[PDB]
Structures are given as C-alpha cells and as structure tokens.
Structure 1
C-alpha cells in the first residue's frame, strides 16, 4: 500500500545495509491458498532452516520428472515427491556433520567417470591382443618403441599443459601404455583390475552415503534395483578380475548405458515390443506355410551345397523341420528363397510353379514383413518425439501450480516470469509443507 516503503526494501542491493535486508529477503517465502468459501488469500511465512539443505540436482529431478494426471494437474504427484524430499533433507542434515563421508558422497561423479573410463580402456586392452604372447609384434610403424617414445613425448607435453583443462585421460593412457611395455601385460592387467575393484568398492559406499536408505535397515537397501545393479557390476568385475577376462566385455553394456540419447533410441526400440514380437510370430508362421508347401511340391529342389570338416558336396533336407531351417536360412540373403533352391532350367514342367513360388515368397514375406517391423520402429520414434515436444512445451508455457497459460498475462500489471517465481513458486509450497 505504501509506495514509498515498497521502493526502499526492494532496491537494497546497491546500499550498504545488505546483511539484514537480503538475509530477511532470502529467508522469506510467499504462498497462495484457497479456503472453504473458495476465496484466495496470500500467506507470508519464514522458511524452515532445514529447507536450505536440499541439493539442486534433486530439485531439477522433481521439476522435470513430475507428470500430470487425467485432469491436467501436477500437484498430486508433487505431494508424494515432497514427502520424499522431506526425508531426503532430514538425511542430508544428518549427513552434513561427518567430514569424510560427506566428502565421499559429494564426489560421486569423479568416481563414476574414472571407473567408466578405465573399464573402457581395460576392454580396449583385452580386445586388441588376447593370448598375451608379446607386445613386439604389430602391423604399426617400424618399431613399437617408436610409438612408445611418441606416447612418452605426448605425456611430457601434457604434463606441462593447463591444470586439468583437457587431456587428463591422455596422460593416464600414455602412462598405462608405457607401463605395458616395461613390465609384463598380465601384471599390468592385474593392477588395473585391482584399481577398478577398489574404485568400485569406494563408489558403492559413496552411493549408499548420500542416498541414505541404509539408515532404516537392510530390506529397503537390498530391494533397491539401483543398488542391486551396482552390486552385480561389482560382482562381475571381481569375477573378471579373478577368473579369465571376458566379464569386462560383459560389463561394457553397463558402461555405455549411462547416457540419455543412446538410451532413448534403444528404449524406443523396447517400447512397442509386443507389435515387434507379434510381427516376428507372423513371419514365423508364413515361413512355416511356405516350408510345408515346399515339402509338398518342391521336395527335390532343396539341394544345397555344404563343405565338410575333414576326418559329396551336396545335402538334401527331407524332414519338414530341416525344411523350416532352410527357409529360415533363406529368410536372409535379400533375394528370398529362390537364391538357395536349385535353378529350374526352363524345361522341367514345374517352372512356372517355381517362378510364382519364388516371387510370392520374396514379395510378400520379405517386403511386407520386414518393412512392417521397420515401420513399427519408425512410428515409435514419431510417437516419442511428439510426446516429448508436447510435454516440453506444456512445461515451458504454463505455470506448474496454477496451470494457467502464458496468454492470460498479457499486460495485467504483472509478468508471467515473476508470477512463476514469486506468486506461485513451487519451492515455496514445498517449504510451507
């Protein structure tokens, strides 16, 4: 009401009285509610001291992952997420006392990134030369020591660069390559495996630290799928350290499945999986009918050429199951079944029968069915892109709480961007709860 009073607590950023004014402005929220008589009134309250103990990553997760129900409102799931956020803030305040556990839980990204990187490098080491018979052999430059000296020069040039601006993995890779030639490769791989397993057993503690599920017991931490996945990763890492080496390749999926875009394209493939499975079943039954037709009428045309392992050049398939195997062999090769069956030679009476048989198989099975599978995949891309742009637009041009659109705030003595940060800020609603 007092315009003179209003214009001297707000612009207090440029005055010397900063402590009291910006402290009390920072620690004061504002919320609007509706009472029984459907009247809207405004409440000004102090924020709790525990509400500042909330990580902004969880805030972004709550802002993005909340979805609207059939009535078009996000508050119903927001309440449950608010309760979970309250428990998370309680555990964060409890955790902040410990100096070393908070240091481990504060740096999860470093442990995860270095584990991913050195497991990738471990897979690259086991992939290039498996039998571990030497390092001197190579189709590279005239000496392997030349490439080793080049790597040493690269490491020396990277050791005088800027402090961790770029090339941090380059010097480590050069050092690992230089250690590979000085000492035997199996000691180097044992050292790298021990480093990865100690990295994983400290990262598991770092993960269970800030995600404080383990303070309530054992059932909740055991039943968690993410903890089980991390434990499985640790188990197969220890198994690949102790018996043979291919389990690093096994955990390469868990490595490369950490980002979102590769996830999105794959998991679009796994979205409408039931049309894909049913189309595969349709292909199987079409192959079955074509195989029994070939068993009935073209039994002697199924001569195909094979080569025999040393202790005549042709085999026949007459069991109606080997014929299904041959038709699934001919489901590949693009042309169809006519590329594996013997050539009709234009003079046998079953020539036109062979021509229409081959053309029907090729056209109907190959074209229609394989194009059906690919059309299902493409349509799933279209559906995902449409719903993603729809939810992004409704998040960007609509208030989270009020649900009103940007078009209602044309002039109205206010703006939308101050409405959605002062009048209807949802973190003020969480603070009030």
Structure 2
C-alpha cells in the first residue's frame, strides 16, 4: 500500500504524506550511525530550482575533499532566501514581474541587437525620406516579405511573433521614418530596462541587506550602468548603443570561459609584453647608435589647402625612433627590415645590416610574439582539465558521504538510489532548516 498511484481510490493521502516526509543518516559521539525520518518544514517548499542548481554547481571541495563545510556555510543564505520569497509569493504583481526575469532579459537583448544593426547600417540619416533604399526598395520588398514565413514553418509561435514585430517595424521604417522609429525603440528599451531593474531588485531582495550591500554588489551596478548607457544613447547620441553589445559576454557562458583563459593567467602575459617592449627598446638604441640615417620612412601629407618631399626622418629623437620600431616593426610580418630602407651590397655595413634584421626578427617575432600566444593554449589546456575534473567529481562520487560510484556495486543499493532517498543533499537542508524554526521544548 505504500507505493503511490494506488488503483483503489484514496491514494491522495499516501502521496501527500510521502511528498513531505524526508530521511537522512547521521552519526553520534560514539561513532554509531542512526537513520532518521521526520516531516519536512512548510517553508522549504518555496526553494527555486535555479538556486538548487547554483548550490549544486558552485560548491567546491575543501582541502580534505569534502563539500560539507561550504554547503553548510550557504545554509543561512538559502534560509533567508526562502523567508523573503514566501513574502513574494503572497504579494501583488511584483511577483508577476519577478517571475519573468528571463523574458525581460531576452527582450532587452533582442532589442539592443536589432536597434544596433540599424545604427550600423543606416548612419548617417541625411537621406531617409521616401524609401531610404531607393534602388534597393524593389529588392527590399521581396526580402522583407520572404523573411517572415520561412522561420515560422518548422518552429513555434514566438519566433513568428518576432517576425510580426519585424514586419511592423519595416512597414514604418520608410513610411513613418527611421529616426522616429529609433527614438521609439530607444524609449521602449529604457522602459524595459527599468522594469528589469525593478524586477531584479524585487527578486533578489537587496533591500534587506542595507544600502552599502546593495551598492557594493557587482551585478546591480552592472545592470545600472547600461540603464545609464541607454539613457545617454537616447538623449546624447545614437552611437552609445554600441557599448550595449558588451552584454553578450555576460549573457553567454562559453564566451566567459573563452575570455577567462587570457585573464586567468594574465600576469605572465603582461610580463611577456613588458619583455617585448624591453627588447624593442634595446634594438631602438642600437639602431639610433649605428643606423640613424637608415630610418627613412615614406609618408604622404594632408591636402595642404591652408598650407614637395616624400620621406621624413624618424630617428632624430630617441622617443620617435622607438615609436618607429614599436609601430612599423612589430606589426610588419618580417621584422623591422621591411620598413627600413634597403641598402646595397656595397655598403660597409651591409653585413651588419643583415645581421641586425635577422637578429631582430628571430628574437622578437619568432620568439616573444609567439611565446605570448603559447600561454593562451596552456590556459585552454588547464581550463579543460579543471572542468573535466569537476564534472567527473559531481557525476561519480556522492555529495555528502563521498563514496565513489563503484563502492556501491552489487550491494542491493543502486548508487543512483543511494542518493535519491538515503543520502539526498536537500533533506539535510530541510532538516537543518526545521531545527532553526521548531521550538526547543
């Protein structure tokens, strides 16, 4: 009778009591283990799945190889989160706003992208009246008509709603005008961003931790900066919408992992850049001493108008002569010899010139400019190894007991069940929670 889904009517009670009943295993002072069962609290049913996943992933092993300490240190945060979220469940439309964080973020990004493509394509707006693309209007019509239907065929409605939005925009780009359309979309984006900020403050509950806490957090100031940026973009210049594209690295995780390779080990990268600059300085010194007259660069002058010569000397002062090497030597693919004047074989210093060019090329372009790159591949290797190790740990061993997948073999406990009911990591949280709420009597 204990198995749910009973054929005889009246199995609602058994299921309802099975849902609120948990079970753990603890130890005593005398190293004796005891099996414990008692009902879960009412407050613990308010935990969100996103918090479950965040706690499941961000927890890290300690020195001895136990996630128990860090898991316990996060219990207070989860308790406060549930206490605050219960109020939100029994609260007005603020809950409706807080439930749609993903929707607001998606609309904000799909706005910013489409309202930056227009700026990139059509600026400046000197000619917009009467079919901005005068020769392409015939080419515009069929493309705009054929864009919508193709997406919606093998795909649900929301992308069709996006296509309808695109149709509504394109029927107004040349009729109403492109600049009023951009102003309307900018105002829309500011409205959506302020709604998203309000929703984020509502969901996070930053107000309970004080002013200093809600101004010292990275994410809130992060979201406020692009509210300010959208305000400036609508009020100062349409080019400020370009900075909004930097949210792409935050929205995606693979981009964050890719970028983290260059900055996880950025100190050797910076020091290698400094070493390259030192080498460039030494070569500039040698060139200033010996080949000062060989530093002749071709240059074209601006239209004189207000007010012939074609070559200027660039090693007159040692700073300018360093700038020459640092600009035209590193960028050129064949060392500094590509930009410097090429001598004849009759020169007294022709052999020294060839030695100088080859030595510069081999020490800088071959060695240092590529030793910089080698570090990046090293950090990819390190990051992949770390990620695979974490994945193996989570998918093989147990969160609390720490026993690996094989030890639970043959024994009538299928590991995959050893964790489902016996050593479940969330029953421990529920039982810790109820201790903090039940009276001591």
Q: TM-score range by the shorter chain?
A: over 0.9
Residue 313 of structure 1: CA displacement?
Answer: 6.4
TM-score by length of 1: 0.93
Taking structure 1 as reference, are residues 165 and 130 closer, same or farther at Cα in structure 2, changes over 3 Å only?
closer
Structure 2 Cα separation of the partners of residues 173 and 11 of structure 1: 50
Residue 283 of structure 1: CA displacement?
Answer: 0.1
Residue 177 of structure 1: CA displacement?
Answer: 2.0
Q: Deviations over 1:22-64 (max 9, x none)?
A: 1111110001111111111111010000101011011011001
Taking structure 1 as reference, are residues 256 and 177 closer, same or farther at Cα in structure 2, changes over 3 Å only?
farther
Q: Deviations over 1:199-237 (max 9, x none)?
A: 011111111111112144323222221111111110111
SS at match of 2:45: coil
Structure 2 Cα separation of the partners of residues 141 and 411 of structure 1: 77
* Range with greater deviation from structure 2 (106-115 or 175-184): 175-184
Residue 269 of structure 1: CA displacement?
Answer: 1.4
SS at match of 2:162: helix
Partner of 1:99: 92
- Gaps in structure 2 of 5+ consecutive residues: 305-310, 433-441
SS at match of 1:399: coil
Structure 2 Cα separation of the partners of residues 76 and 380 of structure 1: 29
Residue 143 of structure 1: CA displacement?
Answer: 4.0
Q: 2:303 aligns with which of 296, 306, 310?
A: 310
Q: Deviations over 1:335-373 (max 9, x none)?
A: 000001111110001011011110010011101111111
Q: Is 1:287–1:324's contact at 8 Å kept on the other side of the alignment?
A: no
Structure 2 Cα separation of the partners of residues 371 and 60 of structure 1: 40
Q: Is 1:28–1:45's contact at 8 Å kept on the other side of the alignment?
A: yes
Partner of 2:402: 403
Residue 151 of structure 1: CA displacement?
Answer: 1.9
SS at match of 2:230: helix
Structure 1 Cα separation of the partners of residues 15 and 274 of structure 2: 68
Residue 161 of structure 1: CA displacement?
Answer: 9.4
TM-score by length of 2: 0.91
* Range with greater deviation from structure 2 (318-327 or 227-236): 318-327
RMSD value, Cα: 2.3
Partner of 2:359: 360
Taking structure 1 as reference, are residues 302 and 143 closer, same or farther at Cα in structure 2, changes over 3 Å only?
closer
Residue 13 of structure 1: CA displacement?
Answer: 4.5
SS at match of 1:304: strand
Residue 384 of structure 1: CA displacement?
Answer: 0.1
SS at match of 1:41: strand
Structure 2 Cα separation of the partners of residues 184 and 237 of structure 1: 21
Structure 2 Cα separation of the partners of residues 341 and 56 of structure 1: 64
Structure 1 Cα separation of the partners of residues 47 and 430 of structure 2: 11
Q: Deviations over 1:84-121 (max 9, x none)?
A: 11110001101111231111100111111011011111
* Range with greater deviation from structure 2 (105-114 or 183-192): 183-192
* Range with greater deviation from structure 2 (382-391 or 215-224): 215-224
* Range with greater deviation from structure 2 (379-388 or 123-132): 123-132
Taking structure 1 as reference, are residues 139 and 375 closer, same or farther at Cα in structure 2, changes over 3 Å only?
farther
Q: Is 2:148–2:160's contact at 8 Å kept on the other side of the alignment?
A: no
Taking structure 1 as reference, are residues 47 and 370 closer, same or farther at Cα in structure 2, changes over 3 Å only?
same
Residue 12 of structure 1: CA displacement?
Answer: 4.9
Taking structure 1 as reference, are residues 352 and 230 closer, same or farther at Cα in structure 2, changes over 3 Å only?
same
Residue 190 of structure 1: CA displacement?
Answer: 0.8
Residue 171 of structure 1: CA displacement?
Answer: 2.3
Q: Is 1:32–1:423's contact at 8 Å kept on the other side of the alignment?
A: yes
Q: Is 2:148–2:163's contact at 8 Å kept on the other side of the alignment?
A: yes
Q: Deviations over 1:259-297 (max 9, x none)?
A: 101111012111110000000000000001111011111
* Range with greater deviation from structure 2 (314-323 or 16-25): 314-323
Residue 147 of structure 1: CA displacement?
Answer: 1.4
Residue 316 of structure 1: CA displacement?
Answer: 5.4
Q: Is 2:281–2:322's contact at 8 Å kept on the other side of the alignment?
A: no
Q: Is 1:307–1:313's contact at 8 Å kept on the other side of the alignment?
A: no
Q: Is 2:249–2:256's contact at 8 Å kept on the other side of the alignment?
A: no
